[PDB]
């Protein structure tokens, strides 16, 4: 359910008409929690806008993972240069990616694990460097229980100073003017729990849990 609360919260962040990129894994779940009246356009790195679920499978139509997908009405095709011209040029309003590690300096690591075989970075670096808003959707701690939100990433960086918003199943962090801010805490959790399970140094918003 954690992945779902994360995805749902991230989904609540997106604005109507936003151009969004969803990485493989957790972020695609964001597609299943868009509020009513909120319509987005999904961009696929392999070169098209208007990504959607499979209707009738087509061999020449796949997602960034090479798996069969579909398109919505008004979809547009283009080459990879155009694709990453869009991605790098800031024409993606928001990207939602998974994460292995994030730190107080807004650095990101999410393309390689030391000790595991290296898959390559793909389009992640361009995405996090180019996107107008970089949202990281990830579990708070690893499967061994160790913290993933650290003072400084130990794994190879995807990018430096790129993360704008970090959404976990325990809390929501924002990076504003260089400093890291804890802006929301999840229900069933406390400040001590977030602090205890987080190695990153962060300041807490005074008006935590209030209406806007």
């Amino acid at each position: 359910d954690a992945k779902q609360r994360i995805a749902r919260r991230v989904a609540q962040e997106l604005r109507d008409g936003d151009i969004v990129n969803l990485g493989i894994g957790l972020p695609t779940m964001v597609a299943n929690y868009l509020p009513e009246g909120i319509h987005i356009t999904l961009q696929s790195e392999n070169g098209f806008l208007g990504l959607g679920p499979v209707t009738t499978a087509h061999p020449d139509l796949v997602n960034a993972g090479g798996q069969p997908c579909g398109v919505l009405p008004g979809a547009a095709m283009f080459d990879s240069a155009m694709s990453f011209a869009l991605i790098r040029g800031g024409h993606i309003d928001a990207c939602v990616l998974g994460g292995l590690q994030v730190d107080e300096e807004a650095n990101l690591a999410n393309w390689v694990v030391p000790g595991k075989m290296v898959p390559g970075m793909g389009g992640a670096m361009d995405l996090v460097t180019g996107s107008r808003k970089v949202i990281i959707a990830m579990e708070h701690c690893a499967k061994d229980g160790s913290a993933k939100i650290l003072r400084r990433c130990t794994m190879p960086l995807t990018a430096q100073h790129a993360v704008h918003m970090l959404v976990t199943e325990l809390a929501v962090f924002r990076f504003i003017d260089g400093k890291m801010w804890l802006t929301e805490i999840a229900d069933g959790c406390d400040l001590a729990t977030v602090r205890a399970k987080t190695e990153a140094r962060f300041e807490v918003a005074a008006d935590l849990n209030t209406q806007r």
Binding site: F84, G122, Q160
Partner: protein, 215 residues
């Protein structure tokens, strides 16, 4: 004069130590017959440039599996364990480049540009061995153009002049490698007559296409 050629004659372009650009994203957009012909030729020591190494039985996978490649330049290799193993073992050299950077390197190679400044990879291992420039208070990696001896392209429709159109997500790298290679070979799904492709529908003009593989 004609650009039409058989697959058997096309093999004459293959040779050891050659650098080849191959179209396709995760195998989608790769010319199958050309790859099979390249494999069947028996040439080795190849340097392949593509978005990825695809899967074992698709894209440039078969070329990697049969040890016909000594060097790879790409952005992702995760879906092909063979690439990774030969990378780890040392049998194969692998250059992992950010996708957006790689495609721009290819574009530069094709567009006669000497290089470009990108923020992608700054502060990462990608930055290693590269020149960095400070502009507007921002640090940029200076990336340089990539070219090749040969390009293997897949297209949807193709006329006798070599004008190409593409279908859905099979486009990706194909339009760019067409400009970045000394010699270009296209494998069209459908061969049409000149005039059947509208001027405003053609993606790759026939000028950059040298030879067309006949079915």
């Amino acid at each position: 004069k004609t650009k039409l050629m058989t697959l058997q004659d096309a093999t004459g372009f293959f040779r050891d130590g050659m650098t080849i650009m191959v179209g396709g994203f995760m195998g989608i957009g790769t010319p199958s017959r050309l790859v099979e012909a390249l494999l069947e030729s028996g040439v080795r020591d190849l340097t392949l440039i593509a978005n990825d190494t695809a899967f074992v039985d698709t894209g440039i996978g078969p070329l990697i599996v049969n040890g016909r490649v000594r060097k790879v330049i790409a952005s992702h290799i995760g879906t092909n364990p063979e690439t990774g193993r030969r990378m780890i073992s040392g049998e194969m050299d692998v250059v992992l480049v950010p996708q957006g950077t790689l495609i721009e390197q290819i574009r530069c190679g094709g567009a006669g540009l000497g290089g470009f400044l990108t923020p992608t990879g700054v502060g990462t291992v990608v930055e290693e061995g590269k020149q960095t420039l400070t502009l507007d208070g921002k640090t940029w990696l200076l990336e340089r153009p990539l070219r090749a001896d040969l390009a293997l392209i897949r297209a949807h429709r193709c006329d006798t002049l070599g004008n190409l159109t593409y279908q859905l997500s099979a486009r990706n790298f194909n339009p760019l490698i067409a400009l970045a290679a000394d010699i270009t070979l296209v494998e069209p799904d459908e061969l049409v007559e000149t005039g059947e492709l509208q001027p405003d529908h053609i993606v790759t003009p026939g000028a950059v296409i040298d030879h067309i593989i006949v079915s």
